[model samples]
Target: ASYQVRLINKKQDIDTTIEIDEETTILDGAEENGIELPFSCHSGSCSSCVGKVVEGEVDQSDQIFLDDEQMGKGFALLCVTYPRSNCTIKTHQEPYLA
Candidate 1:
């Protein structure tokens, strides 16, 4: 039910690691630890809390900004991203969605 998640954001030169489970969103997990991820709206629409999955998978059924094609390319909205396995995520990826 729980797995390790590695967080990296080269645009801001930050990195950290945290544990997450199936029910918790990646942004929430990072926020609970006071890790500096990015966000605008807490909802799934803004795509402000975007993350590019470097490894593993996330259940992004609740996210709206990314389409199936972008999602297939590893883009995920961390606001609604539920970890499906151990993950390595690159945070602060709003530019990619643009």
Candidate 2:
């Protein structure tokens, strides 16, 4: 089935509804939606794509850099995460995010 990606705080929302064959990563969906989600290495090697989970759940393909405290606080690495369910994500927040 297809999926939707909504970006909170930003005016843009990507409701492409594109069919996902498997567990599609967040970065994959972002790229498909033409959103330039800041990322490097495309793998879990780089923490450049780190984001805070404002609201919702995500299935992490790999939780390498995320510490227990960070995970508890909702920080996530977009490079290896997929929507376990629909989510309202925050991108490039003020101060730290930008």
Candidate 3:
């Protein structure tokens, strides 16, 4: 399945939207599509690729940076998140790791 993903920076100054596979990570999908999103530790253990979902759902079960409450509030690890719906995201948002 394919999903549409719209990405913007923390200041919302940059916007790059693309189509991605449901099984593919948002980070990989963005890079492959030339979106150049920030990332490190693709293993889902780091917050380097953190972002917030402006709209839509993702499967972030393997990611741990955000607690259930945080996740419910749309925080996600782009390196591990997979789109479950058309997604609008703001990248470079710091995860609520506290």
All-Cα superposition RMSD per candidate? 1.2, 3.6, 1.9
Please give the ranking of all candidate structures by lDDT, highest first, separated by commas.
1, 3, 2
Off by over 4 Å in 2: 9-22, 93-98
Q: Residue pairs in steric clash, candidate 1?
A: none
Across 1-98, the per-residue lDDT of candidate 2 in tens digits comes to 44455664444443333333237887777777677777877677656777677776887747686667767777778888887666666764323532
* lDDT top scorer: 1
lDDT of 3 at 11: 61
List lDDT for all candidates, in order.
0.87, 0.65, 0.86
lDDT of 1 by residue, 4-36 (tens): 999997667778889877798998999888886
Question: What ordering of candidates by TM-score runs from best to worst?
Answer: 1, 3, 2
Give the clash count for each candidate.
0, 0, 0
Question: Which pairs clash (backbone N, Cα, C closer than 3 Å) in model 2?
Answer: none
Give candidate 3's error at residue 68 in angstroms: 1.4
TM-score of 3: 0.88
